[PDB]
Design a protein around this nucleic acid. Structure first.
Ligand code: DCP
Ligand code: DCP
Ligand code: QPJ
Ligand code: CA
Ligand code: CA
Ligand code: CA
Length: 326
DNA sequence: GTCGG
DNA sequence: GCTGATGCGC
DNA sequence: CCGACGGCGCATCAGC
């Protein structure tokens, strides 16, 4: 990729700040800078050139000058060599181990994959599943497998109730040739912002997918959000497909557009769009767009009849899902 | 770490 | 049990 | 310089 050296440097810094320093605003600053540089259509020749971009300040310009002159960054060189950093950066790759749990495990002398497998009794349900499928969850999902997965989920949901609509969102809906996981937005007319006329609406879909051995494990489950594990069926004598992460979010049917905007992302696109909405005097979540009073108190939800209406309120030209990726 | 007031 | 904080997730 | 930085679901735990 153009400027791939710089954007990789910035992503490594972002992850260090998140996982090791526990500094969420530096994590987000580095990612916002990586994303703006990834879209810049020239090979960056200096830090001064990069610093012209919004989200690139003095300190990133200085690291770009070091990286362009030497091909490395001394700060990352040191982070790679530091045992506590290295240990924490590894443990946080396990689903369910965040920065706080990683540091606590390193304190207890639990620092390698072999230490985790010796200590399953010290992991919660989520972490145990994270560890079981550590390699599988590393692997990306080809679009060809995502289409197979779509066909199973859409067909099994129709078997439960023809009135469900299931939409595959995330990087898949942005047209990606591969996905990190599957994200399914679910609506049913019985669940609106005015009423739940039927219990178990998410549960009955989870149950059906478990029944046909598509959903294999559960990391977390409530009334509106499932987070778990799924797997494609394989043929006679064939190697099994890797286990995959799946998220299902049940959104009130009348708030589909806000919900599909949220679930389509990217996450960096959502942060950028929601920060732009605040500048314009609105707040966006997965349900509504609301004005802000001078007070900073959100007013009543605004009428939304398309994704594009949300862009119109905040005076952005529409971006098709494919133009919302980094 | 960066930006805008 | 409930409520609010925090961790980890989307 | 300095306040703000997106917004929210589920799991877990402390205090009552
Ligand atoms: N911090 C986050 C994480 C995610 N999301 C939203 C936008 C994402 O598009 C969607 C699903 O999140 P994923 O982490 O599954 O991301 P993607 O599907 O975009 O990418 P990948 O290909 O890695 O799954 O949820 C968000 O708004 N804020
Ligand atoms: N041990 C510490 C360190 C810092 N602080 C507070 C004081 C400041 O509000 C901020 C950090 O102060 P610094 O010395 O880092 O620099 P400032 O930015 O406060 O300096 P100035 O006010 O000159 O900008 O956190 C604190 O209460 N206790
Ligand atoms: C990258 C340089 C750092 O920018 P931020 O406020 O995280 C600072 O200049 C501190 O330098 P460090 O000694 O590299 O952390
Ligand atoms: Ca995804
Ligand atoms: Ca996901
Ligand atoms: Ca949200």
């Amino acid at each position: 990729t153009l400027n791939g050296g710089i954007t990789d440097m910035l992503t490594e810094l972002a992850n260090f700040e998140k996982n090791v320093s526990q500094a969420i605003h530096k994590y987000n600053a580095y990612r916002k800078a990586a994303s703006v540089i990834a879209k810049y259509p020239h090979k960056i020749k200096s830090g001064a050139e990069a610093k012209k971009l919004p989200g690139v300040g003095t300190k990133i310009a200085e690291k770009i000058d070091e990286f362009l002159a030497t091909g490395k960054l001394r700060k990352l060189e040191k982070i790679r060599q530091d045992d506590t950093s290295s240990s924490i950066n590894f443990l946080t790759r396990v689903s369910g181990i965040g920065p706080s749990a990683a540091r606590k495990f390193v304190d207890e002398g639990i620092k390698t994959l072999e230490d985790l497998r010796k200590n399953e009794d010290k992991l919660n349900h989520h972490q145990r599943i994270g560890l079981k499928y550590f390699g599988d969850f590393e692997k990306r999902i080809p679009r060809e497998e995502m289409l197979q997965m779509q066909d199973i989920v859409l067909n099994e949901v129709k078997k439960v109730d023809s009135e469900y609509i299931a939409t595959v969102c995330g990087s898949f809906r942005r047209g990606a040739e591969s996905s990190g996981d599957m994200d399914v937005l679910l609506t049913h007319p019985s669940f609106t912002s005015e009423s739940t006329k039927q219990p178990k609406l998410l549960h009955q879909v989870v149950e059906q997918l478990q029944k046909v051995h598509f959903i294999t494990d559960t990391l977390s489950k409530g009334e509106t959000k499932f987070m778990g594990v799924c797997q494609l069926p394989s043929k006679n004598d064939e190697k099994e497909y890797p286990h995959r992460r799946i998220d299902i979010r049940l959104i009130p049917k009348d708030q589909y557009y806000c919900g599909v905007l949220y679930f389509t992302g990217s996450d960096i696109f959502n942060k950028n769009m929601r920060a732009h909405a605040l500048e314009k005097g609105f707040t966006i979540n997965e349900y509504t767009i609301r004005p802000l009073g001078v007070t900073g108190v959100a007013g009543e939800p605004l009428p939304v009849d398309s994704e594009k209406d949300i862009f119109d309120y905040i005076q952005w030209k529409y971006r098709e899902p494919k133009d919302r990726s980094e």
